[PDB]
Amino acid sequence: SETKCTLKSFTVEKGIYQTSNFRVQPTESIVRFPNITNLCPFHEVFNATTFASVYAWNRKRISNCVADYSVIYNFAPFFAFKCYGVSPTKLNDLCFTNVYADSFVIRGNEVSQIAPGQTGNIADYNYKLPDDFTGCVIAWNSNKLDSKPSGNYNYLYRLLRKSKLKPFERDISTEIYQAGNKPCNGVAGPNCYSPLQSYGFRPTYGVGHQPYRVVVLSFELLHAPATVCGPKKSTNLVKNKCVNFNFNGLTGTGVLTESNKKFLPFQQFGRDIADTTDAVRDPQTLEILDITPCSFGGVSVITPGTNTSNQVAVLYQGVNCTWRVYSTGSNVFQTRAGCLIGAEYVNNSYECDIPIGAGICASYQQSIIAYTMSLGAENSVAYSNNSIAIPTNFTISVTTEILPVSMTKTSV
Amino acid sequence: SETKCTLKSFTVEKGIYQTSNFRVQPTESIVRFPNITNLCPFHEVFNATTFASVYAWNRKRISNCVADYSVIYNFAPFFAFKCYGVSPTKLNDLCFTN
Amino acid sequence: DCTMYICGDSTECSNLLLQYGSFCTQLKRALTGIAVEQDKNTQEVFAQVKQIYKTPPIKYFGGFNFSQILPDPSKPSKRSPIEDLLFNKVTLICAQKFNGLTVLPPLLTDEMIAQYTSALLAGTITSGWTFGAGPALQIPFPMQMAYRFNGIGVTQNVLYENQKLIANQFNSAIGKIQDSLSSTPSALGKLQDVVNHNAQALNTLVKQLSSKFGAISSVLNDILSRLDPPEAEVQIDRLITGRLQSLQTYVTQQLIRAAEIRASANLAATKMSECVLGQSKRVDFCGKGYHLMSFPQSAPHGVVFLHVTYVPAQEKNFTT
Amino acid sequence: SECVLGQSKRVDFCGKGYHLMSFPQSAPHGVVFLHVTYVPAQEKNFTTAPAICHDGKAHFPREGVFVSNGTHWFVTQRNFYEPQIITTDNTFVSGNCDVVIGIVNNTVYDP
Amino acid sequence: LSRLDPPEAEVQIDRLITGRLQSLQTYVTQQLIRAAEIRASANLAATKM
Amino acid sequence: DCTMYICGDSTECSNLLLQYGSFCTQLKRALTGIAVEQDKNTQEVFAQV
């Protein structure tokens, strides 16, 4: 029926055909995490007091920790979770190599200014970001607590900077009046225009003059070490079985076997010229496991004409059978082309009508049989040093030969 | 060593082999613009024998000329400025209609 | 298998592949076409006769020695020493096997090719050239030698007076040809290039598979883990387009090479049928100089022809 | 061009077996050829000798080869059996009776 | 490069890169197609010579 | 050439090109093969003596 589908007809002729591949299915899932499970010191920039500003970005080098959903979302009224890399819908079941929760506390009038395209205070060489900036933007409110009466003058921002500032670089200085034709240098005074801008927001002001704390993250992937992610049950591995393996944020599908080579003491992500992960180290122990995918194949169907019969014999290309061939049938063979089930075997020699490979040919006898090649009839002509053979009759034979010359013209 | 690098192997037998180009670097840079720069009317409204009263401020629109930013820093009494938005240092590089 | 090559085990990528119309069918059909044509190519260059002949055991061809061409039963594989030197002189697979880039075994094994060439040698030794037309006719080797000499304008009395010299020159030259072939290892360049060009093209495609086309990464699975579905369609499309362009380039180059290979095989078939089973009078088609005969020998992916010729050496000037 | 307008002796190009003639016919998108050929049917085995001794004189046939049905000797062409009496016009003489190998002794008639 | 910004520059460079790459691919494939036929004609010329 | 045709003398164009990376090596290889073969093509049509 599959061959009938692929031919898009109601009668197949003869010979080799093709269909989809074998694709043996996996069994289950394995998690592989370090057994050490401490608690992550999140929420420190979230609920204590007035934390920081744009003058001191929170350069928190978070060490090994276990962070999850429970500590975060401590206050429900957030703002737009402006995704840049991973979507905010899923933040668990993936581990980061590092994280740097940058923070600044300015008002929430201009939330879009943090974008690489949307500019503003950032454009005049303030706190900058690169073009990718894979972390999200957490613009959570800070009203009625940082909204000090008559203005939080201790909260302030830099109006301008003379020269170009690289992203993630601190420029906190006197910032004298180096501009202008008059050589004031921030000391003489006229049109000095210091970057100092203290805040005079009374709570009676609009919502554009109320503080909204902004924290952002930054990380990267495709690295062996990890430091922070959510919890999971790292069940023990399975030996030589087609499972779905996960190793601290990197997934896959294949069989895991014991390693034979030796890794360097700090090396845990070995690979070869195949440019794919050949082996990996255990997250808990020193055990190194080689990965090789579960077996593919090539499925082919052998049939005579539907005018004669409707039996078939199926061959799996390039798969040893002796073996991973699911169910069975009448007879199983071990030809060098792969596995073959459906046809018998016989040592008698016959010509070929249905080729298979490596000199094996099958045909209808009252059954589908298979054999090896037969080149032709054996012969041997007598020979001497003084013997000759001469003909006496002659026949006239005519044969044909067909040749195409012209194929149909076309225009578009 | 360059041929070894570009052959992705540690041995080369014999014969010619193709490698990257010569590509002599450029020496310096030259811009060119016409000498004539006509004056915009900033200094025309700046400089006058008499000035309009503060009761009614007469509107003027300046457009379609060459700015010549040096005319702003040309006068003698220079002790009152409040520059916002576009500084005089970053003035003469942006384009404005009026 | 393009569907597994473009995307692994993720049905969403397959559903995206259905948006590009019927294209995998064309690639699979063209690949089956080139495969079956390359399998058919050898049958018109080798199976030129339908009778496996066997030479008599006693070799008494007027002093000629044919030990370097006929099969030797001492080696279990029925190959002559020339064939064994041919097999010896001409010379990561799991990585290409793991991505659906499988190879297929040919229809005819090497033993059957050796049988065909041995049968052809027996036919051209013991039966003259009549076996290319009708029934095999037995002819002793000196008489066939005399008639082949008569074919090129030298009367047949000349051979019968210098038989031993002909035998000695033939045997010495046949002895020389083995070391002459084995001395220069660069003389087998055609088949070597044929193998390595295809091998390096396959390896180039496999290394091309792991190269991001301006997307977030190269692996589809982790990107599916990070990005949320209905905005990931704009993400995993450059992978598909770039891999399809690479596949189209690969199949076009394969077709281009197959055309030239089939043309060369047709030329080889005509040369075999016009220089082995007969004696051509076309200058520089079956050797160099006046043509006398040719012998075939098998080789991994192809043939090598021993052309036996004739050249006048010393001369004197006269008045006409 | 080389199969109809002339006759070619290139084997397996103008047909199968020895080539004699060919006739072309048309077909939708292309041509078909009929090849009139010629093949020998049945054969007999004979004993042959390369040369004939006579008065210390070696003889060689102008065409064909010498055959012998056991009784006497004749000379005939290569592709058909048609024996004829050995005569000095059918052969030419060169050398003597020792250089060649396998020569037999017989007589040749001269008118 | 002077028009737009480097974040918004690569959104237009890609189309130029694809177009020029496609043109180069077409030229090279046509070159191969012509070269095969010229080699066949040269081989016939050598046989005639 | 790979880069001088596909781009100008700008570093971001070469940076955008190396994402594909292994494309123009095939281009240069095919052109060099054609050049060497067509150089060879006269030898077996003239150098026969």
mmCIF file of N, CA and C in Angstrom, chain A residues 182-247:
data_model
loop_
_atom_site.group_PDB
_atom_site.id
_atom_site.type_symbol
_atom_site.label_atom_id
_atom_site.label_comp_id
_atom_site.label_asym_id
_atom_site.label_seq_id
_atom_site.Cartn_x
_atom_site.Cartn_y
_atom_site.Cartn_z
ATOM 1 N N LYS A 182 34.735 79.191 24.851
ATOM 2 C CA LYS A 182 35.313 79.771 26.057
ATOM 3 C C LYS A 182 36.013 78.684 26.868
ATOM 4 N N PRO A 183 37.281 78.871 27.240
ATOM 5 C CA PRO A 183 38.021 77.837 27.985
ATOM 6 C C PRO A 183 37.692 77.842 29.476
ATOM 7 N N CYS A 184 36.433 77.541 29.797
ATOM 8 C CA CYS A 184 36.010 77.509 31.191
ATOM 9 C C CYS A 184 36.563 76.286 31.909
ATOM 10 N N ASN A 185 36.480 75.117 31.261
ATOM 11 C CA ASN A 185 36.889 73.824 31.823
ATOM 12 C C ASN A 185 36.183 73.532 33.147
ATOM 13 N N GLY A 186 34.914 73.928 33.240
ATOM 14 C CA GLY A 186 34.106 73.649 34.411
ATOM 15 C C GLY A 186 34.411 74.486 35.631
ATOM 16 N N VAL A 187 35.295 75.476 35.518
ATOM 17 C CA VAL A 187 35.709 76.292 36.650
ATOM 18 C C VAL A 187 35.238 77.734 36.507
ATOM 19 N N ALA A 188 35.280 78.284 35.289
ATOM 20 C CA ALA A 188 34.922 79.687 35.095
ATOM 21 C C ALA A 188 33.431 79.919 35.311
ATOM 22 N N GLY A 189 32.583 79.060 34.745
ATOM 23 C CA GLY A 189 31.168 79.120 35.042
ATOM 24 C C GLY A 189 30.143 79.378 33.941
ATOM 25 N N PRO A 190 30.345 80.357 33.045
ATOM 26 C CA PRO A 190 29.271 80.688 32.091
ATOM 27 C C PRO A 190 29.010 79.574 31.088
ATOM 28 N N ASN A 191 27.731 79.183 30.998
ATOM 29 C CA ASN A 191 27.254 78.097 30.132
ATOM 30 C C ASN A 191 28.010 76.796 30.395
ATOM 31 N N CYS A 192 28.250 76.502 31.676
ATOM 32 C CA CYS A 192 28.985 75.296 32.042
ATOM 33 C C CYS A 192 28.201 74.041 31.678
ATOM 34 N N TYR A 193 26.916 74.008 32.040
ATOM 35 C CA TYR A 193 25.986 72.919 31.727
ATOM 36 C C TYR A 193 26.527 71.571 32.201
ATOM 37 N N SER A 194 26.683 71.465 33.518
ATOM 38 C CA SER A 194 27.156 70.230 34.118
ATOM 39 C C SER A 194 26.128 69.121 33.900
ATOM 40 N N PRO A 195 26.580 67.872 33.752
ATOM 41 C CA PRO A 195 25.632 66.765 33.538
ATOM 42 C C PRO A 195 24.688 66.517 34.701
ATOM 43 N N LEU A 196 24.988 67.046 35.888
ATOM 44 C CA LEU A 196 24.138 66.988 37.073
ATOM 45 C C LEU A 196 22.690 67.345 36.769
ATOM 46 N N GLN A 197 21.785 66.395 37.003
ATOM 47 C CA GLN A 197 20.353 66.682 36.977
ATOM 48 C C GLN A 197 19.731 65.932 38.149
ATOM 49 N N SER A 198 19.544 66.636 39.262
ATOM 50 C CA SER A 198 18.816 66.108 40.401
ATOM 51 C C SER A 198 17.319 66.135 40.112
ATOM 52 N N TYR A 199 16.561 65.414 40.928
ATOM 53 C CA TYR A 199 15.155 65.161 40.655
ATOM 54 C C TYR A 199 14.292 65.963 41.619
ATOM 55 N N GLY A 200 13.332 66.705 41.071
ATOM 56 C CA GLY A 200 12.436 67.507 41.878
ATOM 57 C C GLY A 200 10.990 67.063 41.778
ATOM 58 N N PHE A 201 10.761 65.752 41.782
ATOM 59 C CA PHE A 201 9.422 65.195 41.596
ATOM 60 C C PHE A 201 8.712 65.088 42.947
ATOM 61 N N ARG A 202 7.745 65.970 43.163
ATOM 62 C CA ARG A 202 6.776 65.761 44.221
ATOM 63 C C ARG A 202 5.830 64.633 43.811
ATOM 64 N N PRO A 203 5.238 63.919 44.776
ATOM 65 C CA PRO A 203 4.227 62.905 44.422
ATOM 66 C C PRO A 203 2.991 63.470 43.735
ATOM 67 N N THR A 204 2.755 64.781 43.814
ATOM 68 C CA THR A 204 1.657 65.412 43.088
ATOM 69 C C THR A 204 1.901 65.485 41.586
ATOM 70 N N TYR A 205 3.107 65.164 41.119
ATOM 71 C CA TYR A 205 3.421 65.199 39.698
ATOM 72 C C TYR A 205 2.706 64.068 38.958
ATOM 73 N N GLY A 206 2.904 64.029 37.643
ATOM 74 C CA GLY A 206 2.346 62.976 36.824
ATOM 75 C C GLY A 206 3.103 61.671 36.974
ATOM 76 N N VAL A 207 2.601 60.648 36.279
ATOM 77 C CA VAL A 207 3.228 59.332 36.336
ATOM 78 C C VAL A 207 4.565 59.320 35.603
ATOM 79 N N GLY A 208 4.819 60.305 34.740
ATOM 80 C CA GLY A 208 6.117 60.426 34.104
ATOM 81 C C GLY A 208 7.206 60.950 35.012
ATOM 82 N N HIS A 209 6.848 61.431 36.196
ATOM 83 C CA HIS A 209 7.801 61.874 37.203
ATOM 84 C C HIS A 209 7.717 60.989 38.438
ATOM 85 N N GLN A 210 7.617 59.678 38.228
ATOM 86 C CA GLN A 210 7.628 58.705 39.306
ATOM 87 C C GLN A 210 8.623 57.606 38.963
ATOM 88 N N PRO A 211 9.397 57.131 39.937
ATOM 89 C CA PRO A 211 10.498 56.214 39.616
ATOM 90 C C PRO A 211 10.000 54.820 39.267
ATOM 91 N N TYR A 212 10.617 54.232 38.243
ATOM 92 C CA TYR A 212 10.364 52.854 37.837
ATOM 93 C C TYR A 212 11.720 52.169 37.744
ATOM 94 N N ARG A 213 11.995 51.256 38.672
ATOM 95 C CA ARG A 213 13.281 50.571 38.691
ATOM 96 C C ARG A 213 13.403 49.633 37.498
ATOM 97 N N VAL A 214 14.556 49.657 36.834
ATOM 98 C CA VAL A 214 14.810 48.801 35.686
ATOM 99 C C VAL A 214 15.988 47.894 36.005
ATOM 100 N N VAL A 215 15.754 46.587 35.938
ATOM 101 C CA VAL A 215 16.802 45.577 36.019
ATOM 102 C C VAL A 215 16.784 44.787 34.720
ATOM 103 N N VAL A 216 17.966 44.449 34.219
ATOM 104 C CA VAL A 216 18.109 43.654 33.010
ATOM 105 C C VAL A 216 19.122 42.550 33.272
ATOM 106 N N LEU A 217 19.046 41.512 32.451
ATOM 107 C CA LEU A 217 19.922 40.355 32.548
ATOM 108 C C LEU A 217 20.810 40.288 31.312
ATOM 109 N N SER A 218 21.783 39.382 31.358
ATOM 110 C CA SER A 218 22.710 39.166 30.255
ATOM 111 C C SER A 218 23.382 37.823 30.470
ATOM 112 N N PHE A 219 23.404 36.994 29.434
ATOM 113 C CA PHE A 219 23.950 35.650 29.549
ATOM 114 C C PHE A 219 24.384 35.188 28.164
ATOM 115 N N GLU A 220 24.822 33.935 28.081
ATOM 116 C CA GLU A 220 25.142 33.302 26.810
ATOM 117 C C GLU A 220 25.035 31.798 27.001
ATOM 118 N N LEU A 221 25.022 31.079 25.883
ATOM 119 C CA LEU A 221 24.858 29.632 25.917
ATOM 120 C C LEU A 221 25.958 28.941 25.121
ATOM 121 N N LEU A 222 25.793 27.634 24.900
ATOM 122 C CA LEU A 222 26.776 26.767 24.241
ATOM 123 C C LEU A 222 28.119 26.804 24.973
ATOM 124 N N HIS A 223 28.064 26.460 26.258
ATOM 125 C CA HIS A 223 29.258 26.312 27.073
ATOM 126 C C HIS A 223 29.011 25.221 28.101
ATOM 127 N N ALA A 224 30.062 24.463 28.407
ATOM 128 C CA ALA A 224 29.935 23.344 29.340
ATOM 129 C C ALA A 224 29.563 23.745 30.771
ATOM 130 N N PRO A 225 30.205 24.719 31.433
ATOM 131 C CA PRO A 225 29.797 25.023 32.810
ATOM 132 C C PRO A 225 28.471 25.767 32.867
ATOM 133 N N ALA A 226 27.803 25.619 34.008
ATOM 134 C CA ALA A 226 26.560 26.318 34.289
ATOM 135 C C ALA A 226 26.548 26.709 35.759
ATOM 136 N N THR A 227 25.740 27.716 36.085
ATOM 137 C CA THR A 227 25.750 28.243 37.443
ATOM 138 C C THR A 227 24.357 28.398 38.038
ATOM 139 N N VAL A 228 23.338 28.579 37.203
ATOM 140 C CA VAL A 228 22.011 28.923 37.704
ATOM 141 C C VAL A 228 20.946 28.402 36.746
ATOM 142 N N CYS A 229 19.965 27.693 37.308
ATOM 143 C CA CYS A 229 18.718 27.293 36.657
ATOM 144 C C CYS A 229 17.798 26.694 37.715
ATOM 145 N N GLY A 230 16.611 26.278 37.272
ATOM 146 C CA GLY A 230 15.615 25.735 38.160
ATOM 147 C C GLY A 230 15.891 24.293 38.527
ATOM 148 N N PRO A 231 15.040 23.751 39.392
ATOM 149 C CA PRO A 231 15.246 22.388 39.886
ATOM 150 C C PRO A 231 14.636 21.329 38.983
ATOM 151 N N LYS A 232 15.259 20.155 39.009
ATOM 152 C CA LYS A 232 14.767 18.999 38.273
ATOM 153 C C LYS A 232 15.345 17.741 38.904
ATOM 154 N N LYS A 233 14.653 16.626 38.689
ATOM 155 C CA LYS A 233 15.060 15.333 39.239
ATOM 156 C C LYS A 233 15.992 14.655 38.243
ATOM 157 N N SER A 234 17.288 14.677 38.537
ATOM 158 C CA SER A 234 18.284 14.044 37.676
ATOM 159 C C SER A 234 18.296 12.551 37.971
ATOM 160 N N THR A 235 17.469 11.811 37.239
ATOM 161 C CA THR A 235 17.405 10.368 37.396
ATOM 162 C C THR A 235 18.658 9.728 36.799
ATOM 163 N N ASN A 236 18.979 8.527 37.276
ATOM 164 C CA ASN A 236 20.169 7.820 36.826
ATOM 165 C C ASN A 236 20.059 7.433 35.355
ATOM 166 N N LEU A 237 21.214 7.318 34.708
ATOM 167 C CA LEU A 237 21.295 7.088 33.274
ATOM 168 C C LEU A 237 20.937 5.644 32.927
ATOM 169 N N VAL A 238 20.748 5.406 31.631
ATOM 170 C CA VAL A 238 20.486 4.081 31.089
ATOM 171 C C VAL A 238 21.637 3.709 30.168
ATOM 172 N N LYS A 239 22.098 2.467 30.270
ATOM 173 C CA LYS A 239 23.259 2.011 29.519
ATOM 174 C C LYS A 239 22.814 1.373 28.209
ATOM 175 N N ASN A 240 23.286 1.938 27.094
ATOM 176 C CA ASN A 240 23.111 1.394 25.743
ATOM 177 C C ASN A 240 21.633 1.244 25.376
ATOM 178 N N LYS A 241 20.906 2.353 25.488
ATOM 179 C CA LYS A 241 19.492 2.364 25.154
ATOM 180 C C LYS A 241 19.130 3.700 24.524
ATOM 181 N N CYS A 242 18.215 3.649 23.558
ATOM 182 C CA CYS A 242 17.818 4.830 22.803
ATOM 183 C C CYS A 242 16.952 5.729 23.672
ATOM 184 N N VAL A 243 17.577 6.671 24.373
ATOM 185 C CA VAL A 243 16.875 7.542 25.303
ATOM 186 C C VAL A 243 17.047 8.984 24.854
ATOM 187 N N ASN A 244 16.253 9.862 25.458
ATOM 188 C CA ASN A 244 16.343 11.298 25.231
ATOM 189 C C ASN A 244 17.134 11.905 26.381
ATOM 190 N N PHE A 245 18.402 12.207 26.132
ATOM 191 C CA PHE A 245 19.305 12.662 27.178
ATOM 192 C C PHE A 245 19.333 14.183 27.238
ATOM 193 N N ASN A 246 19.311 14.710 28.459
ATOM 194 C CA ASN A 246 19.469 16.131 28.724
ATOM 195 C C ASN A 246 20.607 16.299 29.717
ATOM 196 N N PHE A 247 21.523 17.218 29.421
ATOM 197 C CA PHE A 247 22.697 17.448 30.261
ATOM 198 C C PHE A 247 22.788 18.938 30.576
#
